[PDB]
Design a protein around this ligand. Structure first.
Ligand code: NA
Ligand code: NA
Lengths: 57, 11, 56
């Protein structure tokens, strides 16, 4: 599962992933609650799902 | 131009 | 189109709708971006859609 960042978001906890508009997020593990875990080149972490769009195929 | 979205609370 | 509040939200703007868990939001009109316009009581305003669940 991959996704691309639609809105910027700054981590607020050491377990969160700071994402920026455009980046592709990989190794994405879903889960209800509004937060997903995945990696963007650098770090891995929990990022807010409503700020990114899931890629197809 | 919608305002910035809000993340769902960490619960 | 109605929904029920899942998380609490304190409207941080004159045009925002303050919502509380359990409340029924109605006359909701959607719009991309993370904010919906709906109504509770006699109050209407904008609130984050990921903060409520749309009733089936
Ligand atoms: Na999303
Ligand atoms: Na929702």
């Amino acid at each position: 599962v991959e996704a691309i960042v639609e809105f910027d978001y700054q981590a607020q906890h050491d377990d969160e992933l700071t994402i920026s508009v455009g980046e592709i997020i990989t190794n994405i593990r879903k889960e209800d609650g509004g937060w997903w875990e995945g990696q963007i080149n650098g770090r891995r972490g929990l990022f807010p799902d409503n700020f990114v769009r899931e890629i197809k195929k | 131009p919608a305002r910035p979205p809000k993340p769902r609370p960490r619960r």
